[PDB]
Amino acid sequence: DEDETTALVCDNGSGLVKAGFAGDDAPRAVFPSIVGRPRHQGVMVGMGQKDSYVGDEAQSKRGILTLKYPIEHGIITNWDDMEKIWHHTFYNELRVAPEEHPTLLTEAPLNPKANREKMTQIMFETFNVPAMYVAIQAVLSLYASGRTTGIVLDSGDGVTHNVPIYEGYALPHAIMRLDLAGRDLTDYLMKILTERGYSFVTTAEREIVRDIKEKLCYVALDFENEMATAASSSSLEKSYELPDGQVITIGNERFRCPETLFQPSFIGMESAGIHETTYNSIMKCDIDIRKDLYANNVMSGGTTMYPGIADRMQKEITALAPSTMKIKIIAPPERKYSVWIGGSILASLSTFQQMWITKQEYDEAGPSIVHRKCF
């Protein structure tokens, strides 16, 4: 329905699928990266019924479906379910067809190469896209925030990346890829809500908990003080209404979950927290770099939207950092969806139109070509 061959831009993560066209300032539509399948035997005849449901269809009919996410902490493994997600994203939402548009997809700098190769292969072989470009999420995160220099803190559902970039250059030795993410917070919250007498173990229950987290959770600037009062009084409790009419009242779990970002040991992770990884990624850089990176810690992705998160990390980084120098976190409202915006910025740059893999070079070389053409 577009009147120009604008690139399509999409962030296909372990959580949400964000999509729109290059040149806009927001995805046109956002939905979960879900393909659902019936877990029951049908008994009525002439009921239609799909073998599998996609995106909002998967959630709408979820009462009898098991729901799977094709992307595992940033990498695509179930490419067949992702073909369905892309087809839905492009044709039933954006009303575009990749065949008529070049397409940009994105991944973290230390994301296994298999992800970039499979995304390239499917868009060229099943969607017949005229061109492809796998972008770096860190590049897109700083484009959207307006920086050439800073730390990308992309703390979303899949993985936290923690990468320093200076004057548009990577400083890769200082990347602290961390297995701590929004996806772990959903499962951790299911376990601490179990402690309160409300057990959650199934897909429907997981989707309920993901909704509780997204609507009730925060981290707070001072954890121990927030904990002491939440654990002592109903004044810091907040209720949540479940799809079936049940009501759950949540106290310190409201922040104890999110606090795992600063205290990863809560989920058994060997980590000092996201503020230390930010700190060390800067400390491993030269001193004429550090002055600019400490003043530009930049948030992207989910969990960055929690109350107290920018202040919590800035406080800890500042405490670890030397004096005189200023430490600051950049945390714009275009949060959680800013990498998509960065994709639009990259896709539309004149300096980027020579970076595309065309569907000529692709067939001559095969999908491994992405490893040499994109970055």
Partner: peptide, 29 residues
């Protein structure tokens, strides 16, 4: 409070920047 969400960002950023300027303006010596 949409008005606040943005005014909040505006004022925190503007005061932080103004303060950073106040501090540098003196600190530069």
């Amino acid at each position: 409070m949409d008005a606040i969400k943005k005014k909040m960002q505006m004022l925190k950023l503007d005061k932080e920047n103004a303060l950073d300027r106040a501090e540098q303006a003196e600190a530069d010596k």
